Amino acid sequence: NILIRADESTNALVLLADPDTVNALEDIVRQLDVPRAQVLVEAAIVEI
Amino acid sequence: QNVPFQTGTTVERKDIGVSLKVTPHINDGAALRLE
């Protein structure tokens, strides 16, 4: 059996699985939770 | 202030002045997200 349910309050995830499936879902989660990247955009306009 | 503005005369109330609306998302540690 396999049960993954959510919680949007503390943003958490409740897993219920056998420990091999627990390690596989940890491998999924550790490769889907990354800090994303930022861009500073400087647009410039010249008119003569 | 809070001012009226015409949408026709069918005027409406609307807020004017310094304003801020934050929505965070907080990791257990560093690198918070802000909206």
UniProtKB/Swiss-Prot annotation, chain A:
Report the subcellular localization.
Cell outer membrane
Q: Which domain of life is it from?
A: Bacteria
Q: What happens when the gene is disrupted?
A: Loss of export of PrpL, elastase LasB, chitin binding protein D (CbpD), aminopeptidase PaAP, and metalloprotease ImpA, still exports LapA and AprA.
Q: What does this protein do?
A: Involved in a type II secretion system (T2SS, formerly general secretion pathway, GSP) for the export of proteins. This subunit forms the outer membrane channel. Among its substrates are PrpL, elastase LasB, chitin binding protein D (CbpD), aminopeptidase PaAP, and metalloprotease ImpA.
Subunit details for this protein?
Forms a cylindrical channel with 15 subunits. The closed pentadecameric channel is 170 Angstroms long and 140 Angstroms in diameter.
Comment text on domains: The N0, N1, N2 and N3 domains are periplasmic, while the secretin and S domains form a channel that is partially inserted in the outer membrane. The N1, N2 and N3 domains each form a periplasmic ring; the N0 domain was present but not resolved by electron microscopy. The secretin domain forms a double beta-barrel structure; the outer barrel has a diameter of about 140 Angstroms while the inner barrel forms the central gate with a small pore in the closed state. Isolated N-terminus (domains N0, N1 and N2) assembles as a hexamer of dimers (i.e. dodecamers).
Family listed: Belongs to the bacterial secretin family. GSP D subfamily.
What name does UniProt use for this protein?
Answer: Secretin XcpQ
Q: Which organism is it from?
A: Pseudomonas aeruginosa (strain ATCC 15692 / DSM 22644 / CIP 104116 / JCM 14847 / LMG 12228 / 1C / PRS 101 / PAO1)
List the top taxonomic levels of the source.
Bacteria, Pseudomonadati, Pseudomonadota, Gammaproteobacteria, Pseudomonadales
By which gene is this protein encoded?
A: xcpQ
Q: Which stretch of the intact protein is present?
A: 323 to 370 of 658
